[PDB]
Amino acid sequence: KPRILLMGLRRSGKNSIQKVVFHKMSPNETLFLESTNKIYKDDISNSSFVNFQIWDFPGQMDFFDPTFDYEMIFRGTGALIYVIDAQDDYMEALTRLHITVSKAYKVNPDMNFEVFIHKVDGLSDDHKIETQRDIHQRANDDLADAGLEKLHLSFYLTSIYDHSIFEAFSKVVQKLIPQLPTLENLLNIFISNSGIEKAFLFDVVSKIYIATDSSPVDMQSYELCCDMIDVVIDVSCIYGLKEDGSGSAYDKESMAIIKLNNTTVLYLKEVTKFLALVCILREESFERKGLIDYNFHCFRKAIHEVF
Amino acid sequence: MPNTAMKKKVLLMGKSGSGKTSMRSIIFANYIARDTRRLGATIDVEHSHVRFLGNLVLNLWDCGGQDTFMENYFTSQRDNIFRNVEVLIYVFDVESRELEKDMHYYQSCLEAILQNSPDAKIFCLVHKMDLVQEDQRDLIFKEREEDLRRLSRPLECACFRTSIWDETLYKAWSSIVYQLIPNVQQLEMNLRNFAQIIEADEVLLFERATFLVISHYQCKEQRDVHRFEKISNIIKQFKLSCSKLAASFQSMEVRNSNFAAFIDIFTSNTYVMVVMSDPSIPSAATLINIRNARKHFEKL
Amino acid sequence: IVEIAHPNDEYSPLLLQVKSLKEDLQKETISVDQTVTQVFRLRPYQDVYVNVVDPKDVTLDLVELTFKDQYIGRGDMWRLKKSLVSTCAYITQKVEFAGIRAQAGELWVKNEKVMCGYISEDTRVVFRSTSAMVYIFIQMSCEMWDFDIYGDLYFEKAVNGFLADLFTKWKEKNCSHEVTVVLFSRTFYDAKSVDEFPEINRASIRQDHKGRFYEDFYKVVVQNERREEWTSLLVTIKKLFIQYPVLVRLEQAEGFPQGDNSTSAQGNYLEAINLSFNVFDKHYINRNFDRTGQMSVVITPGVGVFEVDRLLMILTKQRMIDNGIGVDLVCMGEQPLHAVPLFKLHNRGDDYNIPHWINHSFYTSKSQLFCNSFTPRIKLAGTLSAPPVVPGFCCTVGVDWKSLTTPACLPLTTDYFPDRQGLQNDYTEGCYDLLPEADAQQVFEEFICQRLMQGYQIIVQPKTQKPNPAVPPPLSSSPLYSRGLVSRNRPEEEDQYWLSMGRTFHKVTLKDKMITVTRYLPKPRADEDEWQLLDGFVRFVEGLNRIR
Ligand SMILES: Nc1nc2c(ncn2[C@@H]2O[C@H](COP(=O)(O)OP(=O)(O)NP(=O)(O)O)[C@@H](O)[C@H]2O)c(=O)[nH]1
């Protein structure tokens, strides 16, 4: 349930990398200024994606004075970002995370608090395990006594520019409110006449994307599909939509296939308005119309027909 | 392909500090702008051969930039180093302060290449403009333009601007290659015939292993200069991403609202992309025209 | 690839060899008559129905190869191992390749020596010589003229017993080395006389002030000379033992002399091993074609204690990083009640250190009595502290004759962690395409470019014997001098190196650099020829390979 807001550890120094994250995602999150509201489960979350402002990041000097305004911002679904950095300013902030979280869980029904472990580049294979044991040791007496405080302890893989924040951000939007397990297992039924390895449901260029049945297995395929959507969108962006039609006008009749050596094809096809689908495919020779395109056409019709 | 295996010679020199061997190492070893922080100090001289679409092979010399190494270039074995030189690239830092010693080395290098090469050419390249605001980037590049046009008086030079975190690097070395290429007019004529009888928006042909913009033809002149740079950067980023998957690319297709672009192998070391001015056509046209193109280029 | 074994009834050894897919036994062979008198006497005619035809994948986990009378750089050892991937062997075969020859020896599977067997790609071969170049440094002190238990001088024990045994074993295993026999010792308070000034040195201690004059003497006996029929050196060493105290006491400077200081109190030991390294670094200068292995043996009557400066010990660690050649043996006997090779530091709790690079061995004499005491006695008239030396257990150390008669060359394959990040912040790649030519001009371009033979990294050679006054004791050499300055440098601060040398067709050699360990990876002359040659030239100097 993201009403995600940006609270690092210092206003003038963490906002460098926080603003790199902002200009990494939010130039395609900022479509939601006048798009819509009030109807969906992610529209409030996208309006929170819009309101990525800043505050005073150690807030325990003023536990009352700013909080008033964002009291409203922390009523109804409930999330807030938090950083676990590399240097020795981790244990005192890790102690006062309870100070940051107490008002939060007392002011709002069931929240999930996004403590990301972030930019500790230079971790060994056992040292990352013992620094995980650090938060396992000093995050016990705040979790085992609360009640309705939902915490998300995520571990970014600690480099400068890795893709390993937004599969966990995909997990938190899976944890938003899935009204679609019927759509999940019916989509598993739709990959029965398919190249059944990966069928990722995508939305528009905003870099949050949902997934079923195939995320962590045997390869980070979420990395290659992110590269896929970034390549096709950056081709279509100013090389494809500068001459006729504005760049804000998406309306994409864009399909894209990528072949590779062992007869393996990447496949993006998308309705013009908001929905998209990348369904990869194995060593198969589709020169027909009775196997793939007919039934895939039928359930892209269905996936546009659902909501 | 007629394999006239010549052997060209190209030196890369300048002052130490910023971006001497980093740009070579990201353009011929599949690196990124982040992982080039680990190259560090070079030595006096190190060189390489790189093969490039078959016949042409580059002796690429990388020269260091300490005081003793430049002195041991100029007042020493100079006659061996500056002999049979075709292409010189001379690197300019922006942030560096000792401009007097830089232009002093530049004057000595121009006089030495004049007394040891009559028909070589010099490209000077001001890199690392990623730290200065864009209006001051315009001012600094125009000042380097005029000052280097003055001080490069008896023999001409070509001065370009670049950084590592963008695609003007790919434009500048595309220019180096297109000057350094042997043949022009037959490939232009096949390019023009292909593009004017299969009516495309624009056609683009490239080397495979490094993807520098070899040749191009358009009929919709509404993209200014930055189309080639951008598409080269993003698909070589995609090739770097697919590099960790033990698989080659060789083929792709995309179409959109008013857009139809396709990429494939042409020959032993060449990529093609094309956007075809008619977005509502399936892959039958790409089939019959890769047939139509490989009947001709595999007579070349 | 077929394997044929052939015993007879109850031959307790066996025999086996190779062919290619034998099934019907139409064809037999004669290739060797020697192996009959080498193993067992019988005359097997064409088919006596005993010849077993079996695949029998039985390997020979470690096989030894001895050399004689030649000179073989370690790239040629790599070529022999590359040619010895998938064959058979037996005891005392003469393996040949391209004018290079070795004799097979002491082939083991995991506990037991096998008469014959099969070698396939995963067993390890180890090279040894009987034609090595060997230095013998005899350290003299005041304990040579001191008695021990059983009634002897330690000198007489050392020379008579140990050298008689070593020369008898050198005759028995039929080896032929090139030796030095160098005597060395120290004296105290030999301050100054008429123009004997750059010979002295002056020792001191920081934490408690102590500074004295001392002087180092080397007297050599036969310098570089191979000959059979030894033990004449034993007579000359007896002559020099009797002539030695006047020969060391009453020379160059005459204050009040104190001869031949104690090993457990002072000593020029670490400087002697460092000067042997100062010899062995310049092996490429005048190259004998009749020697392969390198060996430096120090015979001491010491206990195992040495009081050694910090800088020389760290420097010789960094120099035995390159070419490990040092062996120590003690003819004092009396294996003490602690970890016996140890150094008390002498830096400018008593700071201990224990070496794990050295190969120490004791020499017990030959007699039988009741309770061999481990103590001397002499009656006067009148934060961490993480190594101590006493909680380390130590039963007995032998002599290790096999590492003193057939010297072992340095290995080929060692396992170590990869080149990740952090400290070694420097990698450099050079991809060098190769144009074949039919006109000698192709290896050296890559060679002078990609390394300049450790043009990147330094050779840590900080010890320079700049002076040596000599003395007119006779027609051998006799240098008696001071070591001179020691211009030590630290290792490469905050960066090691590693390199990626590519062949642009399909080939990669990944060099690491803390000791030159490689990883070769594949994907007129041919490509593989130049690739193999370049791996051999990286192999010649420091040549470890990673594996798995
Ligand atoms: N962020 C950034 N870093 C740069 C840029 N240009 C160069 N650098 C940094 O400069 C460093 C030096 O690389 P380089 O100049 O090629 O090394 P070199 O000069 O050949 N070594 P030597 O001094 O021995 O000749 C690289 O690590 C690279 O990270 C730039 O535009 N942006």
Coordinates of N, CA and C in Angstrom, one line a residue, chain A residues 121 158-162 219 223-224 227-228 230-232 234-236 238-244 250-262 266 270, chain B residues 34 37 165 201-202 204 220 222-224 227 230-231 234-235 237-238 241-242 244-259 261 273 275 283:
Chain A
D121 N 28.1 -0.6 -1.1 CA 28.9 -1.3 -2.1 C 30.3 -1.6 -1.6
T158 N 23.4 -3.3 -3.5 CA 24.5 -2.4 -3.0 C 25.5 -2.3 -4.1
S159 N 25.1 -1.6 -5.2 CA 26.0 -1.0 -6.2 C 25.5 0.4 -6.5
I160 N 26.1 1.1 -7.5 CA 25.6 2.4 -7.8 C 24.3 2.3 -8.6
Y161 N 24.3 1.7 -9.7 CA 23.2 1.6 -10.6 C 22.9 0.2 -11.0
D162 N 22.1 -0.5 -10.1 CA 21.6 -1.8 -10.4 C 20.1 -1.8 -10.5
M219 N 17.4 -17.0 -13.6 CA 18.0 -15.9 -14.3 C 17.1 -14.7 -13.9
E223 N 15.5 -8.2 -15.4 CA 16.5 -7.3 -15.9 C 16.4 -7.2 -17.4
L224 N 16.3 -8.4 -18.1 CA 16.2 -8.3 -19.6 C 14.9 -7.7 -20.1
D227 N 15.3 -4.0 -19.7 CA 16.1 -3.6 -20.9 C 15.3 -3.5 -22.1
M228 N 14.4 -4.5 -22.3 CA 13.5 -4.6 -23.5 C 12.6 -3.4 -23.5
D230 N 12.9 -0.5 -21.9 CA 13.6 0.7 -22.0 C 14.1 1.0 -23.4
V231 N 14.6 -0.1 -24.1 CA 15.0 0.0 -25.5 C 13.8 0.4 -26.4
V232 N 12.7 -0.3 -26.3 CA 11.6 0.0 -27.3 C 11.0 1.4 -27.0
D234 N 12.6 4.0 -25.7 CA 13.6 5.0 -26.0 C 13.7 5.1 -27.6
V235 N 13.5 4.0 -28.3 CA 13.3 4.2 -29.7 C 12.1 4.9 -30.1
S236 N 11.0 4.6 -29.5 CA 9.7 5.3 -29.8 C 9.6 6.7 -29.3
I238 N 11.6 9.9 -28.9 CA 11.9 11.0 -29.7 C 12.3 10.7 -31.1
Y239 N 12.8 9.5 -31.3 CA 13.1 9.0 -32.7 C 11.8 8.6 -33.4
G240 N 10.7 8.3 -32.7 CA 9.5 7.8 -33.3 C 8.3 8.8 -33.2
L241 N 8.2 9.6 -32.2 CA 7.1 10.5 -32.0 C 7.4 11.9 -31.8
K242 N 8.4 12.4 -32.6 CA 8.6 13.8 -32.7 C 8.0 14.5 -33.9
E243 N 7.9 13.8 -35.0 CA 7.4 14.3 -36.2 C 5.9 14.6 -36.2
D244 N 5.1 13.6 -35.9 CA 3.6 13.7 -35.9 C 3.1 13.1 -34.6
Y250 N 0.4 8.9 -26.2 CA 1.1 7.6 -26.3 C 0.5 6.8 -27.4
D251 N -0.8 6.4 -27.3 CA -1.6 5.7 -28.3 C -0.9 4.7 -29.2
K252 N -0.1 3.8 -28.6 CA 0.9 3.1 -29.3 C 0.3 1.8 -29.9
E253 N 0.4 1.7 -31.2 CA 0.2 0.4 -31.9 C 1.6 -0.2 -32.2
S254 N 2.3 -0.4 -31.1 CA 3.7 -0.8 -31.2 C 3.9 -2.3 -30.8
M255 N 4.2 -3.1 -31.7 CA 4.7 -4.5 -31.4 C 6.2 -4.5 -31.6
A256 N 6.8 -5.5 -30.9 CA 8.2 -5.6 -31.0 C 8.6 -7.0 -30.7
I257 N 9.4 -7.6 -31.6 CA 10.0 -9.0 -31.4 C 11.5 -8.9 -31.5
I258 N 12.2 -9.7 -30.7 CA 13.6 -9.7 -30.7 C 14.0 -11.2 -30.8
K259 N 14.7 -11.6 -31.9 CA 15.1 -13.0 -32.0 C 16.5 -13.1 -31.5
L260 N 16.8 -14.3 -31.1 CA 18.2 -14.7 -30.7 C 18.4 -16.2 -30.9
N261 N 19.7 -16.6 -30.7 CA 20.3 -17.6 -31.5 C 19.7 -18.9 -31.5
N262 N 19.2 -19.3 -30.3 CA 18.6 -20.7 -30.1 C 17.1 -20.7 -30.4
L266 N 11.8 -12.4 -27.8 CA 11.2 -11.5 -26.9 C 10.0 -10.8 -27.6
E270 N 0.9 -4.4 -27.1 CA 0.3 -3.5 -26.1 C -0.9 -2.8 -26.7
Chain B
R34 N 30.5 3.6 -16.0 CA 30.8 3.4 -14.6 C 32.0 2.5 -14.3
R37 N 36.2 3.4 -14.2 CA 36.9 4.0 -13.0 C 38.0 3.1 -12.5
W165 N 29.6 10.0 -20.6 CA 28.3 9.7 -20.2 C 27.2 10.0 -21.2
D201 N 11.7 5.3 -44.9 CA 12.0 6.6 -44.2 C 13.5 6.8 -44.2
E202 N 14.2 5.9 -43.5 CA 15.6 6.0 -43.5 C 16.3 4.6 -43.3
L204 N 20.0 2.5 -42.5 CA 21.2 2.8 -41.7 C 22.0 1.5 -41.7
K220 N 13.3 12.0 -44.7 CA 12.5 12.8 -43.8 C 13.5 13.4 -42.9
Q222 N 13.9 15.6 -40.5 CA 13.4 16.2 -39.4 C 14.0 15.8 -38.1
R223 N 15.0 14.9 -38.1 CA 15.9 14.6 -37.0 C 17.2 15.3 -37.3
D224 N 17.7 16.0 -36.3 CA 18.8 17.0 -36.7 C 20.2 16.4 -36.8
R227 N 20.0 11.6 -34.0 CA 19.3 10.3 -34.1 C 20.4 9.2 -34.1
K230 N 22.0 8.5 -30.6 CA 21.1 8.0 -29.7 C 20.8 6.5 -30.0
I231 N 20.5 6.2 -31.2 CA 20.2 4.8 -31.5 C 21.4 3.9 -31.4
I234 N 21.8 3.3 -27.5 CA 20.8 2.5 -26.8 C 20.9 1.0 -27.3
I235 N 21.1 0.7 -28.6 CA 21.2 -0.7 -29.0 C 22.5 -1.3 -28.6
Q237 N 23.9 -0.5 -25.7 CA 23.5 -0.8 -24.3 C 22.7 -2.1 -24.2
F238 N 21.8 -2.3 -25.2 CA 21.0 -3.6 -25.2 C 21.9 -4.8 -25.5
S241 N 23.7 -5.6 -22.5 CA 22.8 -6.4 -21.6 C 22.7 -7.8 -22.0
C242 N 22.5 -8.1 -23.3 CA 22.4 -9.4 -23.8 C 23.8 -10.2 -23.7
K244 N 25.6 -10.8 -21.2 CA 25.6 -11.6 -20.0 C 24.6 -12.8 -20.1
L245 N 24.1 -13.1 -21.3 CA 23.1 -14.1 -21.5 C 23.6 -15.2 -22.5
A246 N 24.9 -15.1 -22.9 CA 25.6 -16.1 -23.8 C 24.9 -16.2 -25.1
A247 N 24.3 -15.1 -25.7 CA 23.5 -15.2 -26.9 C 23.7 -13.9 -27.7
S248 N 23.6 -14.1 -29.0 CA 23.8 -13.1 -30.0 C 22.5 -12.5 -30.4
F249 N 22.5 -11.3 -31.0 CA 21.3 -10.6 -31.3 C 20.7 -10.8 -32.7
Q250 N 21.4 -10.4 -33.7 CA 21.3 -10.7 -35.2 C 20.0 -10.4 -35.8
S251 N 18.9 -10.1 -35.1 CA 17.6 -9.9 -35.6 C 16.5 -9.3 -34.7
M252 N 15.9 -8.2 -35.1 CA 14.7 -7.7 -34.3 C 13.8 -6.9 -35.3
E253 N 12.6 -6.7 -34.7 CA 11.5 -6.0 -35.5 C 10.7 -5.2 -34.5
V254 N 10.4 -3.9 -34.9 CA 9.4 -3.1 -34.1 C 8.6 -2.3 -35.1
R255 N 7.3 -2.1 -34.8 CA 6.5 -1.2 -35.5 C 5.6 -0.5 -34.5
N256 N 5.1 0.6 -34.9 CA 4.4 1.6 -34.0 C 3.3 2.3 -34.9
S257 N 2.9 3.5 -34.4 CA 1.8 4.2 -35.1 C 2.1 4.6 -36.5
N258 N 3.2 5.4 -36.6 CA 3.7 5.8 -37.9 C 5.2 5.5 -38.1
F259 N 5.5 4.2 -37.8 CA 6.9 3.8 -37.5 C 7.1 2.3 -37.8
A261 N 10.6 -0.1 -37.9 CA 12.0 -0.3 -37.9 C 12.4 -1.7 -37.7
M273 N 19.7 -1.4 -39.8 CA 18.4 -1.1 -39.4 C 17.7 -0.2 -40.5
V275 N 13.8 2.1 -41.1 CA 12.4 2.4 -40.9 C 11.8 2.8 -42.3
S283 N 6.1 -8.9 -41.6 CA 7.5 -9.2 -41.9 C 7.7 -9.8 -43.3

